[PDB]
Amino acid sequence: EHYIKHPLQNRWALWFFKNDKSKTWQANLRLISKFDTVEDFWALYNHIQLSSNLMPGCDYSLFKDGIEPMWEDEKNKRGGRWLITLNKQQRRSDLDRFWLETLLCLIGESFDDYSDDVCGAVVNVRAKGDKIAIWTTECENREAVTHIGRVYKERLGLPPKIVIGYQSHADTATTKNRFVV
Amino acid sequence: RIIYDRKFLMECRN
Numbered sequence: 001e002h003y004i005k006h007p008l009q010n011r012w013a014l015w016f017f018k019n020d021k022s023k024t025w026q027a028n029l030r031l032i033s034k035f036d037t038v039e040d041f042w043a044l045y046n047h048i049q050l051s052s053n054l055m056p057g058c059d060y061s062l063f064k065d066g067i068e069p070m071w072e073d074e075k076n077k078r079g080g081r082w083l084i085t086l087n088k089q090q091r092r093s094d095l096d097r098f099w100l101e102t103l104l105c106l107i108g109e110s111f112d113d114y115s116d117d118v119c120g121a122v123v124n125v126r127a128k129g130d131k132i133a134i135w136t137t138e139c140e141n142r143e144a145v146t147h148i149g150r151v152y153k154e155r156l157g158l159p160p161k162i163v164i165g166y167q168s169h170a171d172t173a174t175t176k177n178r179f180v181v
Numbered sequence: 182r183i184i185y186d187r188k189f190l191m192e193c194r195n
C-alpha cells in the first residue's frame with residue numbers, strides 16, 4: 001500500500017493508426033504499449049499527443065489485451081459501438097475531454113457488471129469531423145449495450161438534447177441505429 | 182472486481 005501499484009481489472013493495450021494508402025488497413029494499425037495499473041496508464045497518457053493534436057486520418061484505440069481493435073476479432077464481430085460524432089468546434093472544446101473520460105470509463109470498469117461487455121474504445125481524428133466510440137462485444141445484449149450507453153452519456157455530461165447511437169459492426173462493415181440514448 | 186472512481190483516477194495523474 002505504501003509501495004504497491006494500483007492494479008486494474010484488465011490489462012489494456014493502446015494502438016495507433018496512421019493512414020498509408022500503400023498498405024492494408026490492418027498493417028497501419030500498430031501497438032504502442034500495454035499497462036495493467038493506474039500508474040502505468042498515466043505514465044503512458046502523459047507522454048503521448050492529445051487527440052486534438054494528431055494529424056487528420058489518425059486513430060487511438062484502447063482495447064483489452066487479447067482483443068484486436070478491428071471488427072474481424074472474435075470478440076468484436078458480433079458487437080457494435082456507441083458513437084459520438086463531433087463537429088469541428090468540438091475538437092477545441094470537447095475531443096480531449098471526452099476521450100480521457102472514455103479511457104477512465106474503461107480502465108475504472110465504470111459500467112458495473114456490464115464492463116465485461118466492453119471491448120475497447122476508439123478516437124478517429126478526421127478533417128470532416130472527429131469521432132469517439134466504445135465497442136461492446138454483442139449487439140444483441142440489449143441490457144448490457146443500453147446500460148453502457150446510459151452511463152457513458154452521463155459520464156460525458158451530454159445534455160438530453162444530444163442523442164447518440166449504437167450501430168452493430170455487421171451493419172457498419174456492410175448506417176442504422178440499433179439503439180439510441 | 183476492481184473498480185475505480187473518476188476522482189481517484191484523476192488524483193493519481195501526477
Ligand SMILES: Nc1nc2c(c(=O)[nH]1)[n+](Cc1ccc(F)cc1)cn2[C@@H]1O[C@H](COP(=O)(O)O)[C@@H](O)[C@H]1O
Nearest residue numbers: 025026069070071072080081124167168169172173
Ligand atoms: N478490415 C477492417 N477495416 C476497417 C476497420 C476494421 O475494423 N476492419 N475499421 C475500423 C472500424 C471498425 C468498426 C467501425 F464501426 C468502424 C470502423 C476501419 N476499416 C477500414 O477503414 C474504412 C474507414 O473507416 P474509419 O471510420 O475507421 O475511418 C472502412 O470502410 C474500412 O475500409
